[PDB]
RNA sequence: AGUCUGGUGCCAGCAGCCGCGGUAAUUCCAGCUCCAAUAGCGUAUAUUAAAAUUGUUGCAGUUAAAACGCUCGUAGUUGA
RNA sequence: AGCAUUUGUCUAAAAUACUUCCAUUAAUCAAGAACGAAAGUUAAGGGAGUGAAGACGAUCAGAUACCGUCGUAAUCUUAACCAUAAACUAUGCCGACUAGGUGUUGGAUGAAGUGCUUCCUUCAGUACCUUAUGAGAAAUCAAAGUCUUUGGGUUCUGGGG
């Protein structure tokens, strides 16, 4: 902790996760980065997003 | 008070056999030039009182088992069984008894009183497999494997065994509601001895 | 509990604290009665002073004196 | 012959603790041993100890708490970088969180946590948990 | 379901004086009747199932003048998925009987694992809280803590068994004849079993003693 | 006791012992010895 | 999570499945030398018992709590 | 020739529930077994009666290693009703 | 992922390895079905991991491979 | 390796005891060296018994073997060589730590049988029995223990058949 490289790179990586939509607002710590999990990542595919939002009637249709 | 010590003293319980043994070295007073070990006694009396407190502290006395397998000690333990609430098992040990749940004879006790650890050794070992602590009448030749409170005593003399049990019984009765510490107990020492 | 055990004196040379079992002795010779400094465990022959008559015979133990003589310990 | 004093001392302590002896007598006292026991004492993994004098190196009698699972000495005295420390601790200690890996540094003998806080590598002495 | 108890501990558990399995674990008592384990973890109206699995059935033969005399040895794994594993071994004449007996043995063996975490309080437990090693025969297995950024990095067998115990993420290693399947399982079980024996900072401090169930409910046994 | 040297300057002994003992292995002998390029009919080509 | 017992004699953790470990309840007296309700308790590990050192350890423990007079 | 477990076991059970009636005659014992037991063969009933007679005959030379009995309870009632130098030094030392 | 269907019948063959094939072949030769990966998928040879079977970390040497016949001793390594 | 009659002479040796001296002089050691059973070799003696070779008589389908009778070489001393042996505790050597009891050979210290004798305590040799919540693949091992909780020092060695 407080290591210069660590604070910089960790924050930068975490910010990138926020941009991706992998971690919510409340979480902001590296153990939630470790906590990232494969369905959570798949949930951010564009096909998935369309299926959720509508437009198509099926994942395959999307 | 003195009287217990004196009554014990007149009986030959102070004469341990040969073969000192390391763990009992602290309870031996000195080896007599003859080749027998004299036993402190005073420590035995204090120890005996401690043992009485642990026996008394068990609310169900039926869960307190006496065990022996020598005829001349058998009478002593049966009498002990009559006077306190403790059940004795005398004669040949049943060597599955404590470990085996489904055997007919069974018994899962809470405490064990053993007459000679060398003699009753399987019962002592079995006791260890199911968390029973074992108070022990212990002698010159005793190992102390799985025995907690060790009571120095000659275990081999019939008078010695009888005297030892008789004092133990008297202490537990005094601790209980039976008799005030002023009065001598009614039962003869002679009553617990073999015939 | 080996920090301060008193009756350890009986153990071999090399205990908790080194201590020699060897000491010096104030000795005097019967019938000649002069004081002499002498060593319990003396390794060579030991004479009385006025006329050289042997006192102690050396041998590989504690040394055996003579049948006579009287011995104080010469520790301070 | 003995060579490094320290290794015998921990080996002796460790046997006593595994055995359940409560107190134990470490035979060849030294400056390093005093520092090691005192360091162990500071972080509460061993009790009070009496160094009894002689005139030939003393002896020490150390009170065990019934708490040391394992203590040993790393030999030879490997050099180790401040950077390397994480890889050492991961290798040796039973957990990242607890137990201590002990070094000798220009700023004195201390565990890794202290070294990390300070700065300075050094040589690795031993460890306990 | 609702059997007649053989012994005092069993009788107390049937009646419901004994709160939960922790109490008997606390006083390290011999959990002789399988019913005791079964009552605490009965699969409905309780927090989590006990899940069985036959891990390995192996043929063994005595060899006689007449012929072979084939018995079936069976290794079975039981686990709650939340802190309790059990390793059961039964050798019997015929297969279905052997499996059934093995499940009984597995329930009897049941041990609580200590669980902890790699870094911080902000997760519930997820790994083996310090390095623990269990040996049996040739084969020595070491469980070593890993961050949650992991799964169980181990042998199929280790993964299954550790998962059964309810430890999510670990680094594992092994040395010796892992192919001797039973021994490997026993070694794994011993390694898991050792976990609550360790003594660590979380447990340095002194504490009090609860009364033993045999003393706390002495009256309730004495009445029968 | 431990049987291998340990010392802070003992690197020489460790290198020399390992270097010789490497020649014990069957696989290693096949890879590093000259016999290979001779007795192999394809001369260590995959195909022919 | 549960908290396992730690030994009175050895200060060490009592295993989950040990069976060799025991809780010995020692009764206090009332002033007359008759049995009080209350109990000073000791927990003795399997390990000292298996060795056979239990009496010696127990004696020192009793002295520390101030029950047995003589110590060792 | 001897007697098997089934025979001996039965022999022990009789006496156990009918000691008072049983007696030192074989024919009377045989009459008692015929009344008491459920055995279906003549030869077997006789065999049991013979062995019960033999056990009854055996008793009155102390215990038969089985069967609770009133006679024992009564018997139990009949059954129930200076020093060495260093040892002196020890007594002196204690006080 | 097949005790499915035909042909062969110790032959033809398969089979890294264990093994399969002597008349019901869950392994051949087919057909049918099923399965793995997929615009990629097989095979060979080399090479790294697996190998804590080259071992500093980190092996083994009573009996499985392995303590020099024994001792002194220079270099070496190690040294209250 | 090996060493058992008597006495003498020349030699070494270890333990003990030591308020004696020196003050790290050490530990293990590739290179190199000393010694190195038995057989065998070379040379002189020597030559009883034993006895590879060999010769016979048997035994056996056969017997160049087991068994039998005889019998060279070798076996013995001196003087050279040879350098291996299941040259075996099949356990490298030094160093610390662990656990009892039974002994025993060698000293030294105290006390108790008739100066001497014995026992106690204690060293150093040295075995055994029990015990290992020690170890080991087990047999078993007080070292093969103090080990995946892996590092007191070091020489040598092994890596499927």
From TrEMBL, chain A:
Entry protein name: 40S ribosomal protein S9, putative
Protein family: Belongs to the universal ribosomal protein uS4 family.
Domain of life per record: Eukaryota
Organismal lineage: Eukaryota, Sar, Alveolata, Apicomplexa, Aconoidasida
Species assigned in the record: Plasmodium falciparum (isolate 3D7)
UniProtKB/TrEMBL annotation, chain D:
GO MF annotations in UniProt: structural constituent of ribosome
Alphabetical keyword list: Ribonucleoprotein, Ribosomal protein
GO biological process: translation
Pfam families named in the record: Ribosomal_S8
Any single Gene Ontology cellular-component annotation: cytosolic small ribosomal subunit
Key word rRNA-binding present: no
Ribonucleoprotein is among the record's keywords: yes
Family: Belongs to the universal ribosomal protein uS8 family.
Protein name: 40S ribosomal protein S15A, putative
Organism: Plasmodium falciparum (isolate 3D7)
Source lineage: Eukaryota, Sar, Alveolata, Apicomplexa, Aconoidasida
UniProtKB/TrEMBL annotation, chain E:
GO MF terms held by the record: RNA binding; structural constituent of ribosome
Keyword terms of this UniProt record: Ribonucleoprotein, Ribosomal protein
Family indicated by similarity: Belongs to the universal ribosomal protein uS5 family.
GO biological process: translation
Protein name: Small ribosomal subunit protein uS5
Taxonomic path: Eukaryota, Sar, Alveolata, Apicomplexa, Aconoidasida
Annotated ranges, domain S5 DRBM: 50-113
GO terms under cellular component: cytosolic small ribosomal subunit
From TrEMBL, chain H:
GO-annotated molecular function: structural constituent of ribosome
GO CC entries: cytosolic small ribosomal subunit; mitochondrion
GO biological process, one term: translation
Superkingdom in the source lineage: Eukaryota
Record key words, sorted: Ribonucleoprotein, Ribosomal protein
Family, similarity comment: Belongs to the eukaryotic ribosomal protein eS17 family.
Protein's name in the database: 40S ribosomal protein S17, putative
Organism in which the protein naturally occurs: Plasmodium falciparum (isolate 3D7)
Lineage per the UniProt record: Eukaryota, Sar, Alveolata, Apicomplexa, Aconoidasida
């Amino acid at each position: 902790e407080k290591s210069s490289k660590r604070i910089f790179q960790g924050e930068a990586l975490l910010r990138r996760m926020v941009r991706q939509g992998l971690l919510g607002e409340n979480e902001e710590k590296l153990d939630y980065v470790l906590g990232l999990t494969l369905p959570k990542l798949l949930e951010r595919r564009l096909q998935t997003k369309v299926f959720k939002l509508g437009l198509a009637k099926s994942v395959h249709h999307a | 008070k003195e009287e217990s010590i004196a009554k014990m003293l007149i009986c030959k319980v102070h004469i341990g056999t040969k073969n000192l043994e390391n763990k009992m070295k602290r309870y031996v007073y000195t080896r007599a030039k003859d080749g027998v070990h004299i036993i402190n006694l005073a420590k035995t009396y204090e120890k005996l009182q401690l043992a009485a407190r642990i026996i008394v502290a068990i609310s169900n006395p039926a869960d307190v088992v006496v065990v022996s397998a020598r005829p001349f000690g058998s009478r002593a333990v049966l009498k002990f069984a009559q006077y306190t609430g403790a059940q004795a098992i005398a004669g040949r040990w049943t060597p599955g008894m404590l470990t085996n749940q489904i055997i007919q004879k069974f018994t899962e006790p809470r405490l064990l009183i053993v007459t000679d650890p060398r003699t009753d050794a399987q019962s002592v070992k079995e006791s260890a497999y199911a968390n029973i602590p074992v108070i022990a009448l212990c002698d010159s030749d005793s190992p102390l494997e799985h025995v907690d409170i060790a009571i120095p005593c000659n275990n081999k003399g019939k008078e010695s065994i009888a005297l030892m049990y008789w004092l133990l019984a008297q202490e537990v009765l005094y601790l209980k509601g039976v008799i005030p510490r002023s009065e001598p107990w009614n039962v003869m020492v002679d009553m617990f001895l073999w015939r | 509990n080996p920090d301060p055990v008193e009756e350890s004196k009986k153990h071999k040379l090399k205990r908790l604290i080194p201590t020699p079992n060897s000491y010096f002795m104030d000795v005097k010779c019967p019938g000649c009665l002069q004081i002499t400094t002498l060593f319990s465990h003396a390794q060579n022959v030991v004479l009385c002073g006025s006329c050289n008559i042997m006192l102690c015979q050396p041998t590989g133990g504690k040394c055996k004196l003579t049948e006579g003589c009287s011995f104080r310990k010469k520790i301070e | 012959v003995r060579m490094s004093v320290l290794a015998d001392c921990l080996k002796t302590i460790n046997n006593a603790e595994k055995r359940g002896r409560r107190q134990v007598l470490i035979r060849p006292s030294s400056k390093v041993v005093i520092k090691f026991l005192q360091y162990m004492q500071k972080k509460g993994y061993i009790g009070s100890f009496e160094i009894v004098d002689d005139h030939r190196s003393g002896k020490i009698v150390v009170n065990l708490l019934g708490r040391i699972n394992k203590c040993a000495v790393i030999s030879p005295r490997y050099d180790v970088k401040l950077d390397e420390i994480e890889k050492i601790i991961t290798s040796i200690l039973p957990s990242r969180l607890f137990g201590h890996l002990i070094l000798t540094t220009p700023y004195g003998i201390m565990d890794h946590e202290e070294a990390r806080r300070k700065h300075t590598g050094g040589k690795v002495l031993g460890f306990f948990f | 379901k609702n059997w007649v108890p053989v012994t005092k501990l069993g009788r107390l558990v049937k009646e419901g004086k004994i709160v939960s399995i922790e109490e008997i674990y606390l006083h390290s008592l011999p959990i002789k009747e399988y019913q005791i384990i079964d009552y605490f973890f009965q699969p409905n109206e309780c927090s989590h199932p006990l899940k069985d699995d036959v891990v390995k059935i192996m043929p063994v033969q005595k060899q006689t003048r007449a012929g072979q005399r084939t018995r079936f040895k069976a290794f079975v794994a039981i686990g709650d998925g939340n802190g309790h594993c059990g390793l059961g071994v039964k050798c019997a004449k015929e297969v279905a009987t052997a499996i059934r007996g093995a499940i009984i043995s597995a329930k009897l063996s049941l041990i609580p694992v200590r669980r902890g975490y790699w870094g911080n309080k902000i997760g519930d437990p997820h790994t083996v809280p310090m390095k623990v090693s269990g040996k049996c025969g040739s084969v020595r297995i070491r469980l070593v803590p890993a961050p949650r950024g992991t799964q169980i990095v181990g042998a199929p067998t280790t993964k299954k068994m550790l998962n059964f115990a309810g430890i999510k993420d670990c680094f594992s290693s092994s040395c010796g004849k892992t192919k001797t399947k039973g021994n490997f399982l026993r070694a794994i079980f011993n390694a898991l079993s050792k976990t609550y024996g360790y003594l660590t900072p979380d447990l340095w401090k002194v504490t009090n003693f609860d009364k033993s169930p045999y003393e706390e409910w002495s009256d309730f046994l004495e009445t029968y | 006791g431990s049987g291998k040297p340990s010392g802070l300057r003992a690197a020489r002994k460790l290198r020399i012992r390992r270097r010789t003992q490497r020649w014990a292995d069957k696989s290693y002998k096949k890879s590093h010895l000259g016999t290979r390029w001779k007795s192999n009919p394809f001369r260590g080509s995959s195909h022919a | 999570i549960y908290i396992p017992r730690k030994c009175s004699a050895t200060s060490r953790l009592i295993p989950a499945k040990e069976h060799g470990a025991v809780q010995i309840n020692v009764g206090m007296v009332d002033a007359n030398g008759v049995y009080n309700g209350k109990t000073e308790t000791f927990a003795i590990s399997g390990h000292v018992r298996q060795n056979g050192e239990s009496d010696a350890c127990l004696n020192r423990l009793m002295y520390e709590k101030k029950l047995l007079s003589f110590q060792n | 020739r001897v007697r098997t477990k089934t025979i001996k076991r039965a022999a022990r059970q009789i006496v156990e529930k009918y000691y008072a009636k049983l007696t030192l005659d074989f024919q009377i014992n045989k009459k008692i077994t015929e009344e008491v037991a459920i055995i279906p063969s003549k030869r077997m009933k006789n065999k049991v009666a013979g062995f019960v007679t033999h056990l009854m005959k055996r008793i009155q030379k102390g215990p038969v290693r089985g069967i609770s009995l009133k006679l024992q309870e009564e018997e139990r009632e009949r059954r129930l009703d200076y020093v060495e130098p260093d040892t002196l030094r020890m007594i002196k030392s204690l006080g």
